[PDB]
Amino acid sequence: SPRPLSPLVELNTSDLIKQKKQLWQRVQHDGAQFRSTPEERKQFKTALITLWGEQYRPERQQRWNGMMQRMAQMKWNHPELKYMATEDLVALQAWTTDDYEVVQDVLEKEARPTAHGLAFAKCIISALHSLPEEYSYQGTVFTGEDQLPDWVSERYQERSITTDRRFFAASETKNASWQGMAVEWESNSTTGKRISMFSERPNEQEVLFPPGTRFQVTRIEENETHPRLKIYQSQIA
Numbered sequence: 001s002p003r004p005l006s007p008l009v010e011l012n013t014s015d016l017i018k019q020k021k022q023l024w025q026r027v028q029h030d031g032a033q034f035r036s037t038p039e040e041r042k043q044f045k046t047a048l049i050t051l052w053g054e055q056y057r058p059e060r061q062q063r064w065n066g067m068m069q070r071m072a073q074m075k076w077n078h079p080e081l082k083y084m085a086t087e088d089l090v091a092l093q094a095w096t097t098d099d100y101e102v103v104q105d106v107l108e109k110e111a112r113p114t115a116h117g118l119a120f121a122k123c124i125i126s127a128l129h130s131l132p133e134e135y136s137y138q139g140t141v142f143t144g145e146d147q148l149p150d151w152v153s154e155r156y157q158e159r160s161i162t163t164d165r166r167f168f169a170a171s172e173t174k175n176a177s178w179q180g181m182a183v184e185w186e187s188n189s190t191t192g193k194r195i196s197m198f199s200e201r202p203n204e205q206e207v208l209f210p211p212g213t214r215f216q217v218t219r220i221e222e223n224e225t226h227p228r229l230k231i232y233q234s235q236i237a
Contacts, residue, residue, distance in 0.1 A: 046119070145182065170187055215234060
């Protein structure tokens, strides 16, 4: 337990694989009922602030404080969000920073997770399942990622359902700016959540799916050029 007036709490760094497996089972079991606990929200705060050691804690503390105040006001400006946990909303903004790298694949099989990443993941997932239904995007969303062809083959196959263990990001638009990544997706979304209201780059019109999302893969096109593989899939909501 922390000392009085401590900004931080202890992160459970022991048996990380068990923690990963336990969170993954919780994701599947709880579905859209998944919610972060008050203690998990404090662990996310510590995770973000301490992500890069004591040297960067003052800067990250200041960023944390600013995001908390922004999301507190977000609830005033957008009353439908009044019941969201403020730290859950902060997680959505944090996802759109470079910290995404510590959390995107943290529930993947054989991925070696950090305590920080697992703490990140709980609040993002909680945010995605507690956002009101008006934040769900119904339509086709577009993704590009830098992945190898074998990475695709392990996870996606024509005519079979993919149960995604990753955070899967996409966009409502297909801007020319990110043309030519190694892999592309065209995904029909039913409950993918629009996070442009929380992003550091709202013009990207990003949509985000949590681990546990299921996609029916309907076609995979192959090209010699990048994108080497283009995946057509539909969310099973």
